[PDB]
């Protein structure tokens, strides 16, 4: 079965523990992953994995980006940069941020620049649709 | 001997036992936060490692170019953990160049650089200080991976050279491999891998660099602290001891004073 | 009887239709198992997405029918 | 290949951004101990 | 005259042409459930280029059956 | 007569239909075969879509074999 | 007539092609959404491949109805 | 008698039928390949499962060849 | 004249192969919409090879038309 | 003769089954090229696959062709 | 006459199998685009490949054309 592990740097949320399923967003893709999924190398985009225990519980966690592994053996590692509780966030905060990003994203400096704020946009948007 | 300069003495040697425990004190507060801080920062870093561990990669011979990275601090009353890393350091870049490869260093902390300026110097690509002053946290591991990658050295293999960190009293020198996405995408051994392009292992790579530089930096000040714990601890009974002695020496220096100026008195007042 | 055979034959090329929508339902059921392979959470979406290709193809299928039964019978 | 990737970043910055987009985002109270621990404080010195 | 028996002929073979129809729909149909399995949140995008992939091989075969008509009343 | 001969010709044209079921019944075992190959944790349901989309599309077969046999003898 | 019904049967036989010009639209459709699904990014030189590819099927799936017309009005 | 010529007609219309069965088997055989080449642990299930595809589709093959003679010999 | 009703019925029973150039067609620029949605900075090396697919899949449906036409034209 | 006529169509519509065999020998072989840029490292079974499938789907192609024949000469 | 007619018929009939060589080649040369913007250091060896599936499914092509040339000119 899985051996699931769940880590951002300053917290562990699973540490090898067991879950039935885990669909986590991916660069190229979101995708579920199960007891014996085809070994990946994905690395993480701006939105929310959800994880279900056991039991039919559920749990989601938004990460801001990382990368997550599947092991040949069914081990699953899922690290992310910012994983918070999805209840941690306020869409009014998300909102505004957002708001304010486009409002200088015609202001595109350079194309550096402009990657920039964009990927700001992009963050914001994922997370205010993970919150609206 | 002379009662002021013994005066002295025990006055300076009373200052170094109070001095370091004091610093004494402040080390175990800091060593009680990066213990706690290094518990999860284990996890991490072990997930990071599972993928290196589970394909068995090698390396391409033909290959030349070499990183090596060494993780220590810019404060230096803890001894000997500096000297570690930094024989290990020189061990495996002798070797390595013995084996005729581009051996580049870089430095995390001034006590590399410092004791290893005199020898090594012309090889060092950048060299991070002001690590130590704070405790490390993700952002200096991504700001060391960025002016890695920035530079204009696309290695091949490199090595980092930290402490591991085993107990309150016990650091071990440790090192461990960083891949290069040639190396990666090069080994039949980790073919199995489904849906990753070669733009993916780009992400992956420069993600897991600052994953282990990350995983370094933590168990290099849980050492440290550590360390520094230990020494001041060793240094404070020391001083204690030696304090001791020259109390006992001072007290019969004040007495043999005593007797001689009564001795004197009397063998003046005795000639009128 | 010449419109008698013509009838016959009409109606057995008419039917042959009813291989576009054997393809369609075939490709829609399979693209279902690769999608919910990948994204299994998604099952309930990708199946009413799945009902919507099937019947939406069985809708030439139905043309095609339509049309043969129309030659056999009704002129 | 991400917009990034063509004007010159590294994951390591796109991950950076993002995780910064997060930051902002937390609840005012819990982004006071997440300010703590999540700066850059390391000094280079060139050649 | 035999000239109704050629014209059941023709409506029975122009009615065929539905068949690339059919299975053009089922690839665009397809095509759309592994795409948004693959990134959930482009939904209403996705459903609007399917809607579009339908309408122009839903044509191609609407008019093979114009045709099949045609033949058969005229 | 020749109606009887154009019973045979209708069945012979209406036995061309099958292909829309070859095509249809490929793709979907390939996409379960593809989709077993992802995520074979999910081989029952991925197993149980297959055989799904193989009886739509073994419908159709029949639906053509069904017509071919009414013209051949049950007109 | 003769000549003028099998002119009607070669029609109806001609317009058989319009079939792989439907498949050929299915299937560059499909890909476009699979790709956008991918890339999002790229949406505009997607489409306007698909414009492209679109165009190059019907044109030249549009012959055998051309011919059709041909054999059916004025020989 | 004209029964042999709607015989030979009707044998040489069925047998297109076997044209999707062609089909099939090199979609099921194609993806075989590709499902083998992206995970190659599982290469007796992943190969179970093509001739099982094989079988279901060589069964309406051979129905389409079966009713073919069948019409040569009714 | 018999001759021409079989020169009508084998030219649209002939133009009908183009059906196979449509679905190839398709194909090629789908997959070059794929392809190029993958990697967007080899466009160059897709689109050649896309207009080399496209050529040799025109030719051979242009081999049915040239059947058609030289039986409808000459004999 | 209206047989040998009746044997020419016949043969002549017995021929287009060859086109479902050629579509899956393209479909084999393009899913063989998609699986050797995906794991380049097996190869070797990629193309024992891809023979099978090859050799398997000309074999009802030939089917077709062998039908035609019979149809001419029998 | 009839065999000047039937041959016609026949010939119409036969060519229309190279639609499926025309399909082969569209799969082959889409799987070659996709498979090069995977991996495209391996494009030699995908190349040869795509070589020998076009000239497999030519094959068959070629082989439809024969036996309606064969039907048509000489017998």
Same mark, same amino acid.
């Given at each position: 079965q899985m051996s699931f592990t769940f880590a951002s740097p300053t917290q562990v949320?699973?540490?090898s523990a067991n879950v039935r399923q885990v669909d986590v967003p991916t660069q190229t893709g979101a995708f579920g992953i199960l007891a014996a999924h085809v070994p990946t190398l994905q690395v993480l985009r701006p939105g929310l994995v959800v994880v279900h225990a056991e039991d039919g519980t559920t749990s989601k966690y938004f990460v801001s980006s990382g990368s997550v592994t599947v092991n040949a053996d069914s081990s699953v590692q899922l690290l992310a940069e910012e994983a918070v509780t999805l209840d941690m966030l306020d869409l009014g905060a998300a909102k505004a941020n957002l708001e304010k990003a486009q409002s200088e994203?015609?202001?595109?400096?350079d194309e550096a620049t402009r990657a920039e704020i964009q990927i700001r946009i992009e963050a914001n948007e994922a997370l205010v649709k993970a919150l609206e | 001997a002379t009662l002021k300069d013994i005066t002295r003495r025990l006055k300076s040697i009373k200052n170094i036992q109070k001095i370091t425990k004091s610093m004494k004190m402040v080390a175990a507060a800091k060593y009680a936060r990066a213990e706690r801080e290094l518990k999860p920062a284990r996890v991490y870093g072990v997930g990071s490692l599972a993928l290196y561990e589970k394909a068995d990669i090698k390396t391409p011979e033909d290959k030349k170019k070499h990183l090596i990275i060494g993780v220590s601090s810019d404060?230096?009353?803890?001894?000997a953990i500096h000297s570690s890393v930094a024989k290990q350091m020189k061990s495996e870049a002798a070797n390595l160049a013995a084996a005729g490869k581009e051996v580049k260093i870089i430095g995390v902390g001034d006590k590399i650089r410092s004791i290893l300026h005199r020898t090594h110097? *012309?090889?060092?690509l950048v060299t991070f200080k002001?690590?130590?002053?704070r405790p490390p946290t993700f952002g200096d591991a991504s700001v060391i991976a960025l002016e890695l990658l920035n530079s204009g050295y696309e290695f091949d293999e490199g090595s980092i050279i930290f402490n591991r960190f085993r107990s309150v009293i016990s650091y071990k020198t440790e090192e461990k491999p960083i891949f290069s996405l040639d190396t990666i995408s090069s080994a039949?051994?980790?073919?199995?891998?489904? *849906?990753?392009d070669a733009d993916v292992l780009r992400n992956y790579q420069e993600y897991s660099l600052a994953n282990i530089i990350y995983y370094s930096l933590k168990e290099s000040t849980t050492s440290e602290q550590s360390a520094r714990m230990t020494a001041m601890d060793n240094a404070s009974k020391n001083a204690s001891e030696m304090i001791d002695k020259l109390t006992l020496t001072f007290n019969r220096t004040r007495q043999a004073v005593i007797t001689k100026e009564l001795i004197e008195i009397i063998s003046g007042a005795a000639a009128l | 009887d010449i419109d008698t055979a013509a009838k016959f034959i009409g109606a057995g090329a008419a039917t042959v239709g009813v291989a576009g929508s054997g393809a369609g339902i075939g490709t829609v059921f399979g693209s279902l198992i690769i999608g919910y392979a990948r994204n299994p959470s998604l099952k309930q979406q990708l199946f009413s997405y799945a009902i919507l290709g099937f019947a939406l193809s069985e809708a030439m299928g139905l043309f095609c029918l339509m049309v043969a039964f129309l030659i056999l019978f009704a002129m | 290949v991400a917009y990034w990737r063509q004007a010159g970043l590294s994951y390591i910055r796109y991950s950076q951004i993002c995780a910064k987009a997060v930051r902002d985002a937390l609840k005012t109270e819990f982004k006071a101990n997440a300010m703590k621990t999540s700066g850059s404080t390391i000094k280079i010195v060139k050649v």
């Open positions: 949320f699973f540490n994203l015609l202001g595109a400096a | 404060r230096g009353l803890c001894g110097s *012309d090889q060092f002001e690590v130590g002053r039949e051994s980790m073919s199995i891998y489904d *849906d990753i | - | -």
